[PDB]
Amino acid sequence: GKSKKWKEILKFPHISQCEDLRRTIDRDYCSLCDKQPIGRLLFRQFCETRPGLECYIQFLDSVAEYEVTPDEKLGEKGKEIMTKYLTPKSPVFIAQVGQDLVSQTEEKLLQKPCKELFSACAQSVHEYLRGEPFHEYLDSMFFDRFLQWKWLERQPVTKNTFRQYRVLGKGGFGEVCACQVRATGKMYACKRLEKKRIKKRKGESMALNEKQILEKVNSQFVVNLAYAYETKDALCLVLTIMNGGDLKFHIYNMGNPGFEEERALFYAAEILCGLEDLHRENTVYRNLKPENILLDDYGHIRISDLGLAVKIPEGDLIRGRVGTVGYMAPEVLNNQRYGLSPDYWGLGCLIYEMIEGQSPFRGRKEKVKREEVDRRVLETEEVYSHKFSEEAKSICKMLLTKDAKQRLGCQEEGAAEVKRHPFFRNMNFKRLEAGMLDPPFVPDPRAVYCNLDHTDDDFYSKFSTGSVSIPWQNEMIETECFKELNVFGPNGTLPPDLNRNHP
Ligand SMILES: COC[C@H](C)NC(=O)c1c(C)[nH]c(/C=C2\C(=O)N=C3CC=C(C(=O)N[C@H](C)c4ccccc4)C=C32)c1C
């Protein structure tokens, strides 16, 4: 599905064009060689040329496989890594680990294997690579290639860059298009916000707050921002596409009025991880309802509609009686000062609704005014049925604690205190975050689950920042554009674009 001339668009620039990039990019190990997807691949490719560095990459890979193995197979896996990497005369022996550190972990196998056993060793490895190996890579041709990729990442994005297919949902104050990148063939979802509506409504600050919150969070369970451009009539937001429906449709139309507890377990586990990634940026969501939980092609879920999200400054509280009738925590209803607690109250509502088939404070077959449902959220205690195990009852009651100070997860521990609840006793988060627990429902691919000033010029420049670094690099990799274009010379020789003699 790539454009006819895609190899011309993503054609590498001559390395001489990247001198300004070379002079300004910060040379941080974690960023260049790990966080940035393409940088990490280029650094690992550099270690393949050095015979002595190959073993360190293979070792860290095998440790990544160990962390995720299930407990009934860590003994044999822990042994396999020992006799291949940590024995003295091994085929691929690691030396910078230290004979004292291997002798310390060698006898740590004698005890109940830990999922994070090799954390000490792996960190000692990163210690070594941060030093000489990293500074050599900086003076290698692979880093010159990295600069070429950054030069492309930085190119301007416009209406031409994309290709709008038929609608993909709609909104009153903002359309939702399809937008596909012509050059790579990658699908997205556009959140077109026209300028005329926002200008007169005076919400420019709330459209920026949403764009920036989406830009900073990078989670497997929240919709990610990939591009932000302005067109001749609107400001656009290119986000992750979900073609699997929303959780409300699957609770009430697809499944019984509700789900099996084990199936609600899976979705709650992913939502919790989604909320945890937002809380790392000390950003609160406050819009947690079944409709905003979306399923993708594979069956996993992401949180959507961050328009009511707000980034709390560390150590401070905010006020705001916002949200949706029936999913607002008591501290929000009372217009008090709150932090992240509204999001754990929401999680309680979602787990309950998934298991029971109705809201904890409103019956599915009940007609109640918006004044009584609120009184219930503030006064009455919810009730449970035989659909809930004792574990399920517990976590819901603790999350639905009226007093936000005794509410589960609203302590100094954070989301960790929630992953520890007996409700998730049979859940292995390491494997869930690695994405190798099969979802309980897989959507069929063929399914369909449904005028100018100057003060605006400065606001538009702050919004239309262009492509987002990590999502863009991931796109290049997924579409195999990196595999095809990332071509060096025969027998480790400098290609033309990387030779400063003849441009
Ligand atoms: C293929 O059949 C499945 C059925 C027919 N369609 C869907 O499930 C299906 C499709 C195609 N797009 C979406 C929708 C999305 C998506 O995908 N990603 C995202 C990321 C972020 C939002 C988001 O913030 N919105 C808020 C409310 C908003 C506010 C104001 C204006 C516009 C939008 C929405 C989406 C959905 C569910």
Side-chain angles (χ1 to χ4, degrees), residues 168 174 176 191 223 239-243 245 294 305 447-450:
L168 292 183
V176 172
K191 183 164 168 172
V223 299
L239 330 179
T240 301
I241 199 192
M242 321 290 286
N243 325 281
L294 308 175
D305 190 353
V448 182
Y449 307 102
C450 59

Side-chain angles (χ1 to χ4, degrees), residues 48 53-63 84-85 92:
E48 305 316 18
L53 298 181
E54 253 281 26
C55 49
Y56 300 91
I57 308 308
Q58 291 165 16
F59 169 71
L60 274 179
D61 288 358
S62 293
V63 173
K84 170 158 187 156
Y85 300 96
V92 293

Side-chain angles (χ1 to χ4, degrees), residues 195-227:
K195 337 197 193 84
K196 313 189 177 184
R197 306 286 102 231
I198 188 64
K199 167 142 178 186
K200 63 173 72 185
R201 289 239 61 173
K202 296 156 263 176
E204 66 295 354
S205 51
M206 230 61 208
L208 199 89
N209 172 72
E210 170 168 24
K211 172 263 172 186
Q212 294 181 334
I213 280 159
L214 281 161
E215 181 178 18
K216 292 299 117 204
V217 69
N218 258 256
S219 172
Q220 264 267 108
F221 310 113
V222 185
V223 299
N224 288 320
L225 179 60
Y227 299 94

Side-chain angles (χ1 to χ4, degrees), residues 65-83:
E65 310 199 11
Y66 174 93
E67 286 164 290
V68 60
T69 300
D71 312 68
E72 292 179 345
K73 279 192 70 168
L74 272 36
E76 45 260 32
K77 295 350 199 163
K79 295 276 95 181
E80 182 174 328
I81 323 182
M82 281 293 182
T83 59

Side-chain angles (χ1 to χ4, degrees), residues 124-144:
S124 183
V125 191
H126 286 282
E127 214 89 284
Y128 168 50
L129 281 304
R130 167 186 332 264
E132 262 307 272
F134 175 45
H135 288 85
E136 298 173 43
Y137 162 81
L138 283 151
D139 213 74
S140 74
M141 56 150 147
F142 300 96
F143 183 62
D144 291 342

